[PDB]
Amino acid sequence: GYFKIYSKHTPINLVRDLPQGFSALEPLVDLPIGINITRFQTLLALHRS
Amino acid sequence: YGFQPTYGVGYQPYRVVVLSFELLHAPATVCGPKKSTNLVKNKCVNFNF
Ligand SMILES: *[C@@H]1O[C@H](CO)[C@@H](O[C@@H]2O[C@H](CO)[C@@H](O)[C@H](O)[C@H]2NC(C)=O)[C@H](O)[C@H]1NC(C)=O
Ligand SMILES: *[C@@H]1O[C@H](CO)[C@@H](O)[C@H](O)[C@H]1NC(C)=O
Numbered sequence: 001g002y003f004k005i006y007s008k009h010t011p012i013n014l015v016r017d018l019p020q021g022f023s024a025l026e027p028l029v030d031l032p033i034g035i036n037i038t039r040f041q042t043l044l045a046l047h048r049s
Numbered sequence: 050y051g052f053q054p055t056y057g058v059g060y061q062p063y064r065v066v067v068l069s070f071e072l073l074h075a076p077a078t079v080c081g082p083k084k085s086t087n088l089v090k091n092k093c094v095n096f097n098f
Contacts, residue, residue: 001075032076 001034 007028012019052062 032078034075 001032003031003033003035005029005031 005028006025008023008025010019010023050062052060056062
């Protein structure tokens with residue numbers, strides 16, 4: 001019954017692939033709630049005019 | 050009702066609030082705090098941090 005979200009952000013100079021490097025992820029947010037989620041989407045933004 | 054300032058005892062308006070506590074298995078969040086007293090250094094004591 002705890003949704004945990006861990007996050008990290010790094011500067012990148014290589015073009016495409018995941019860098020061959022190591023950088024741990026810091027804990028960010030905890031939520032003491034309970035839901036049975038099993039499917040997740042991912043949103044997007046666009047320009048409309 | 051016809052509430053008036055001249056209404057006698059048992060007839061005047063009375064505001065009532067009822068608090069009901071529910072104990073769902075979801076993690077508890079509404080709790081009363083405990084009085085943190087103070088800290089003391091250089092004395093063999095016991096602590097509840
Ligand atoms: C799905 O959610 C339920 C409740 O939100 C979770 O808990 C139990 O689910 C089983 C399903 O048959 C039942 O015993 C009750 O509906 C629930 N019991 C209690 C005490 O809550 C369940 O664990 C969740 N499942 C998943 C996979 O997330
Ligand atoms: C994002 O990248 C820029 C340069 O590419 C860098 O200066 C900045 O610190 C980066 N920010 C994060 C959050 O990684």
